[model samples]
Target chain A: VQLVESGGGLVQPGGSLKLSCAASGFTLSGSNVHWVRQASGKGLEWVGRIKRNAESDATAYAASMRGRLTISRDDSKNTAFLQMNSLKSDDTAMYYCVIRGDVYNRQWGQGTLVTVSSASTKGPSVFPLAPSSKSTSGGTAALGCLVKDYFPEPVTVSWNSGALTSGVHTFPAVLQSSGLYSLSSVVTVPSSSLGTQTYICNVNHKPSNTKVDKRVEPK
Target chain B: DIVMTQSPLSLSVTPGEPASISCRSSQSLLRRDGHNDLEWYLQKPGQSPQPLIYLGSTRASGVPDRFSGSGSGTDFTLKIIRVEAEDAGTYYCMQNKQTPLTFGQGTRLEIKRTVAAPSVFIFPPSDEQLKSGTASVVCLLNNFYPREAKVQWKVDNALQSGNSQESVTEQDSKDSTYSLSSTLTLSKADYEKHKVYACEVTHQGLSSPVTKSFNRGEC
Candidate 1:
């Protein structure tokens, strides 16, 4: 089997993508073309296969990526088509066109790499940790602020008050079990520093025009 | 979110020797039922990685019995009973206790000479000692070369996560080899709804892994 891919290079963020797998060198009607991707080894996704049969009954997907991807095969032209919408930056990689079936037999295409210059994603959810009123009046107390569910890890977190950045950072952007990211910051207060009774945190990630503001207070 | 960490980065062992690998998680891995959801994998150079153990320590179907996973929540280890030239490769510890499944940085194992594996022992708290709702159950992996082991907990054959954990490492002082004791903070409800809590230990040095369990009778 022979397969060749075309229709991708550099796409502006949010642009629509249409890729084709041209097949030859073997019978095409009875076989299925599979579309798989390696998104720059952000490499965490379980590349789902998008397949469809010729009877109008044979479209296959990874069940998970179904909403964002559409695949179709033109039996007459012996080509498989892949269409994706709202492409994002990390959505760029080698899209391999393969032909396979119920068993293990498979054939691969040459391959094509595509890039999305930019795109928007979800904003963050922000909140704060309250301090205990039982603390001593002058001892150090911790003020915590958390921002989660943001994408494009470039988001920067800052406190409304200048002193908390005193090297008292908490864990950085941690990839959650769900593959998204959550970030939390801990700032130590001089107890006396909380003269206003509140600490505020700000998170900004411009790529998606997202901003988060949350507050915490030391008792 | 659970984070996985590995130490030493790499190792060298003789064909007949043994080796141990360590993996630690950042959070309590105890789930509602109190079992750990961890797994181990080995990747051969230029080959796809295969599962060695799953759900913290059960050997995967068809996996060599030589591979065992043992631990509760955090502070886990993978021990090799005896190292072989064919065992040279990269090893990874993965956690499934949370949504963003995580893996430790790979530990490179090089087989050249003299690497020894550990023998594992797991102790469930005695029934008389099970009254404390927050007591710790421990696993002792004694006399392994290279001082490394991976541990995991299972409830009714299911992996666990989100429980407090700790570990202590000791040098033989006599043989210059090492021993390790890891503990999982158990909850009162940990065993009430489950029938068994098993610990599986894996070491790259050994040909097969060791298994132990705390059943309902023990609770």
Candidate 2:
């Protein structure tokens, strides 16, 4: 038996993907086609299967993929299809279609690579926080910028066009439960350096070529 | 964002001697305003990253003169004028020339020194333990220097997971070396399923890995 699988590639998060496996030298009307997936360098996982009979067709999916996965077959074409929706990074894997008998006979496809790209390619919301207290004496003043819900972690946060690099601290992007990234950057400047001059928090979102500037003024 | 690679992933430096780490960016870090938008940071274990250098080659305020950043464009270097014990940690290089910002994987810095490798031993379940429904196998490690070591359990060469035991390191005040013991407890039925149960010890001082195995039948 020979089988070929196709329609696997990059799919954005929150998007739908469909993969088809064409089989020959076998009858799909009386066979059970199992869909399995293996993450990169990981073990094989039983995703679900489509059982086709003379009268009706039945579909089942692993609890992990329930409600988001569908397995269907076309008896006339001797083909099986795996459809998935609401894609995520963790869903990226090589999907294969397998036909197995009760005992020994088994046929499988070469498998296809499916990569779930990040969902949002938008820039993060950039908000600058003014120093809590105005400086009258000496010492230093601190300002902060909070960047939220950005896709693609390679983000940049600069203060005052790089002028205030003396005491700058930029934290790494943190993954949020919402499938987005958040980062925090703070800059400390001498109290004497504060005053009428404005501080600008510059955020550059690389994926979508977005630049946002948030400013804070010390009264 | 471009990828950043760091060379000399592991470094052993002599006290009072100079050490350097190389960071190469996939794209040029030199911005249009004649500024190299590169930064350097040092992160001590269990601590936050501290900014050391910025603007490619300028040392941040309060940063020691011993720490320096140099180079332009795609290639950059972070140098330590004199290595110290306290300076041992991880060094990272970042580029802010474009969004998203990118950072090097990090280079580990360790003070060059020599110490004896740890002694490893694996003890099978005792007769009293065999009488019980469950028993434990202990992996003993002793006389390891630098206080850095790891222990793993393998069943017939396959690593075991779901280890719930907490192994604590003890330092010998006399020799300043470290010792620890890892215990793997399982049911009698689980123990007999594997022919050989081994404990693997990994330490920088050990030129080769140490493994001690206990045969199920013999034990």
Candidate 3:
């Protein structure tokens, strides 16, 4: 579970940021709390994720800054804080702080550089940033995806409505040698497409065809 | 709960070159293993990293199958299927079922002297047409196991001349090992860049070059 931080550094994009990452070796109670952005050279930005035991909420690509990005937690100071309200210049970038146990995400936090200058204060540039939860209609509904270090293989977790039916129960391809691969299937929909229907969690990689889609709504 | 930090832990391989491992997590392992415990591990050099999978996906138990893991939930990957010489080296990834059990700083697999000799290519009408035009890229070689196999054609990184494709050695599984193929013709901007296209396999205790890249849309 390791996650340590209290350092200091951030003076480029409207300054004013408070970072923290403590957590020591396990038991954070179910776990959750993600925030990533690896700009400068691009690739790695899923700026919003928080699920402290189903507090459930996702904000893909930062969702217009989600009112200035905020994820709180203390659990008696186990630590976990990422607050940024007035900053821009592409938010500078490089700001990690992760830990998600129970389905993956594992642990990370040795990155902190939130520059964002040019008088900081823009908004709307979230590419893959996720957070916005709502899935409960027969249990089991957890959707979260973040790609930074590369690990996902022949993956699958589907639920389409564009038409391709057969009861739908596809699950057979779970390889995680760390290259990362995950699979989960359990469909029942039919609540009229479960409130408008649109569930997809597809990731298939090889040589490179790129397919990472996650969109679920049914509460 | 966001906490992941990976840095210089171990890595050293040599047999075909092209190895990289880096998984950082302190937060955003994607909200506590959102992708299902992201995983990746290959400790060939000394052994003891196995598991090859977990929440990230799943593929453990006699893993050899040409090893291939994709990425998602904080970036993930694990690829190895042509880097013999016993694939000498270290590849690490452990998101310990999520929430701090991280590991990804081990990438040491070097061996680049220039002995190349291991060919086998086939990507012509191999099947693909979700909505496209042209596609075909093949390379084949059999016998002459020591004639210094040669097959080339790369579009994204340059190098592409064409002509020199051969075959015939169909023995199925009698210990299959000598293979080669080559063919190229793609449109739609070469299948959307498709990682620039690659297929080079030279082997003789191979020290370098064992390329393999071709994903013309839809996995």
Using lDDT as the measure, the top candidate is 2
lDDT of each: 0.59, 0.68, 0.47
Off by over 4 Å in 3: A1-71, A74-219, B1-119, B126-131, B136-151, B154-185, B188-201, B205-219
- Give per-residue CA lDDT, model 2, range B107-157, as digits (tens): 877666557686564556544446645455655565567767878888888
| C-alpha lDDT of candidate 1 relative to the true structure | 0.59
- Between prediction 2 and prediction 3, the one with superior lDDT is 2
Best by TM-score: 2
| TM-score of every candidate relative to the true structure | 0.33, 0.38, 0.27
Can you tell me which runs of candidate 2 are displaced by over 4 Å?
A: A1-219, B31-34, B119-134, B140-182, B188-219
User: For candidate 3, lDDT tens digit of each residue in B73-162?
Assistant: 666656664555555445556564433243554554433333324433233222222133433444433322333455667767778764
* TM-score ranking, best first: 2, 1, 3
Residues B54-78, candidate 1, lDDT per residue (tens digit)? 6677776566656667778788778
Interface RMSD after interface superposition, model 3: 19.4
Candidate 1, position A198, lDDT: 58
Share of reference contacts found in each model: 0.00, 0.00, 0.00
Q: Which candidate leads the pack in DockQ? A: 3
